[PDB]
Design an enzyme around this catalytic site. Structure first.
Site, PDB file in Angstrom:
ATOM      1  N   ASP A 148       0.839  -1.198   0.000  1.00  0.00           N
ATOM      2  CA  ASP A 148       0.000   0.000   0.000  1.00  0.00           C
ATOM      3  C   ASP A 148       0.876   1.250   0.000  1.00  0.00           C
ATOM      4  O   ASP A 148       1.380   1.665   1.049  1.00  0.00           O
ATOM      5  CB  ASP A 148      -0.934  -0.019   1.205  1.00  0.00           C
ATOM      6  N   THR A 149       1.034   1.865  -1.176  1.00  0.00           N
ATOM      7  CA  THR A 149       1.788   3.109  -1.280  1.00  0.00           C
ATOM      8  C   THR A 149       1.076   4.279  -0.612  1.00  0.00           C
ATOM      9  O   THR A 149       1.707   5.313  -0.369  1.00  0.00           O
ATOM     10  CB  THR A 149       2.051   3.451  -2.747  1.00  0.00           C
ATOM     11  N   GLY A 150      -0.218   4.145  -0.321  1.00  0.00           N
ATOM     12  CA  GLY A 150      -0.958   5.186   0.361  1.00  0.00           C
ATOM     13  C   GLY A 150      -0.888   5.139   1.866  1.00  0.00           C
ATOM     14  O   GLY A 150      -1.371   6.062   2.526  1.00  0.00           O
TER      15      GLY A 150
HETATM   16  C1  LIG Z   1      -4.853   8.951   4.090  1.00  0.00           C
HETATM   17  C2  LIG Z   1      -4.423   8.077   2.870  1.00  0.00           C
HETATM   18  C3  LIG Z   1      -5.102   6.684   2.875  1.00  0.00           C
HETATM   19  C4  LIG Z   1      -6.645   6.754   3.076  1.00  0.00           C
HETATM   20  C5  LIG Z   1      -7.323   7.510   1.914  1.00  0.00           C
HETATM   21  C6  LIG Z   1      -4.475   5.819   4.059  1.00  0.00           C
HETATM   22  N1  LIG Z   1      -4.973   4.438   4.019  1.00  0.00           N
HETATM   23  C7  LIG Z   1      -4.324   3.487   3.048  1.00  0.00           C
HETATM   24  C8  LIG Z   1      -5.302   3.185   1.859  1.00  0.00           C
HETATM   25  O1  LIG Z   1      -4.612   2.556   0.843  1.00  0.00           O
HETATM   26  C9  LIG Z   1      -6.464   2.303   2.316  1.00  0.00           C
HETATM   27  C10 LIG Z   1      -6.020   0.917   2.719  1.00  0.00           C
HETATM   28  C11 LIG Z   1      -7.304   0.084   2.993  1.00  0.00           C
HETATM   29  C12 LIG Z   1      -7.803  -0.932   1.951  1.00  0.00           C
HETATM   30  C13 LIG Z   1      -9.082  -1.753   2.224  1.00  0.00           C
HETATM   31  C14 LIG Z   1      -9.865  -1.550   3.552  1.00  0.00           C
HETATM   32  C15 LIG Z   1      -9.368  -0.531   4.594  1.00  0.00           C
HETATM   33  C16 LIG Z   1      -8.088   0.287   4.321  1.00  0.00           C
HETATM   34  N2  LIG Z   1      -7.388   2.121   1.180  1.00  0.00           N
HETATM   35  C17 LIG Z   1      -8.649   2.911   1.050  1.00  0.00           C
HETATM   36  O2  LIG Z   1      -9.066   3.561   1.948  1.00  0.00           O
HETATM   37  O3  LIG Z   1      -9.319   2.841  -0.212  1.00  0.00           O
HETATM   38  C18 LIG Z   1     -10.808   3.105  -0.231  1.00  0.00           C
HETATM   39  C19 LIG Z   1     -11.074   3.663  -1.334  1.00  0.00           C
HETATM   40  O4  LIG Z   1     -11.047   2.421  -2.411  1.00  0.00           O
HETATM   41  C20 LIG Z   1     -11.548   1.397  -1.800  1.00  0.00           C
HETATM   42  O5  LIG Z   1     -10.596   0.135  -1.871  1.00  0.00           O
HETATM   43  C21 LIG Z   1     -10.040   0.025  -0.686  1.00  0.00           C
HETATM   44  C22 LIG Z   1     -11.045   0.760   0.360  1.00  0.00           C
HETATM   45  C23 LIG Z   1     -11.622   1.775  -0.313  1.00  0.00           C
HETATM   46  S1  LIG Z   1      -5.401   3.778   5.543  1.00  0.00           S
HETATM   47  O6  LIG Z   1      -5.932   2.425   5.411  1.00  0.00           O
HETATM   48  O7  LIG Z   1      -6.511   4.488   6.158  1.00  0.00           O
HETATM   49  C24 LIG Z   1      -3.873   3.854   6.568  1.00  0.00           C
HETATM   50  C25 LIG Z   1      -3.500   5.152   7.309  1.00  0.00           C
HETATM   51  C26 LIG Z   1      -2.209   5.210   8.154  1.00  0.00           C
HETATM   52  C27 LIG Z   1      -1.304   3.980   8.248  1.00  0.00           C
HETATM   53  N3  LIG Z   1      -0.094   4.025   9.033  1.00  0.00           N
HETATM   54  C28 LIG Z   1      -1.685   2.680   7.494  1.00  0.00           C
HETATM   55  C29 LIG Z   1      -2.959   2.621   6.656  1.00  0.00           C
END
Ligand SMILES: CCC(CC)CN(C[C@@H](O)[C@H](Cc1ccccc1)NC(=O)O[C@H]1CO[C@H]2OCC[C@H]21)S(=O)(=O)c1ccc(N)cc1
Lengths: 99, 99
Positions: free
Chosen positions: B25-27
């Site tokens: 997860d690059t995000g």
């Molecule tokens: C602030 C930047 C993003 C949120 C925007 C940060 N996220 C990583 C992200 O990749 C997250 C990782 C994630 C993946 C799946 C379920 C919960 C979290 N994916 C996500 O939220 O994507 C959503 C939008 O598309 C859909 O597919 C995935 C969920 C939906 S996170 O999960 O909240 C996160 C925040 C801080 C740390 N240290 C580790 C992870």
């Protein structure tokens, strides 16, 4: 380009004729942008992240240029903590993970 | 290797003598893993994303093996819906974004 991950992979995007900064997010299935006015029809949808579910407006077949690469796909608009480019568009610009 | 983003970039990891599937997860700034009973001391933390924040336990200098690439650094543990490898460890295995 090749982007290392010592910093957040933030890039400039262009959507609706407006420039913005967005995070390349390989952990996101979908692309989610902060509140903005987008032209065209939209439908309300629900999306869930690490902390729960939010309400968003789904815009289909939206033109969006990511770091000079054009893509046309679905863009969700709502109270996301930051503009994120998800896999639905990363695939369109030919983005891969490499190690 | 090269990983395309048609599907979620899930890979096998090895932590505390356990094999798990985790998202590259690059995000995600920092690695967060589903609830597990790691030994040693920890510090509380709250991390935010779509939907709000969750409370996690911060462990430091935790060894993880990602696709045979060894890394060591911060690992958060809490009620995440999915195991997430963040940039703090992606850098250590030489992972880049490319398009
Ligand atoms: C602030 C930047 C993003 C949120 C925007 C940060 N996220 C990583 C992200 O990749 C997250 C990782 C994630 C993946 C799946 C379920 C919960 C979290 N994916 C996500 O939220 O994507 C959503 C939008 O598309 C859909 O597919 C995935 C969920 C939906 S996170 O999960 O909240 C996160 C925040 C801080 C740390 N240290 C580790 C992870």
């Amino acid at each position: 380009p090749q982007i290392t991950l010592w910093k957040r992979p933030l890039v400039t995007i262009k959507i609706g004729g407006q420039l913005k900064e967005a995070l390349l997010d390989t952990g996101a299935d979908d692309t989610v942008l902060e509140e903005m006015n987008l032209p065209g029809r939209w439908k309300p949808k629900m999306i869930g992240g690490i902390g729960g579910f939010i309400k968003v407006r789904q815009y289909d077949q939206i033109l969006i240029e990511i770091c000079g690469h054009k893509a046309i796909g679905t863009v969700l608009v709502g109270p996301t903590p930051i503009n994120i480019i998800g896999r639905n568009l990363l695939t369109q610009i030919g983005c891969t993970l490499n190690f």
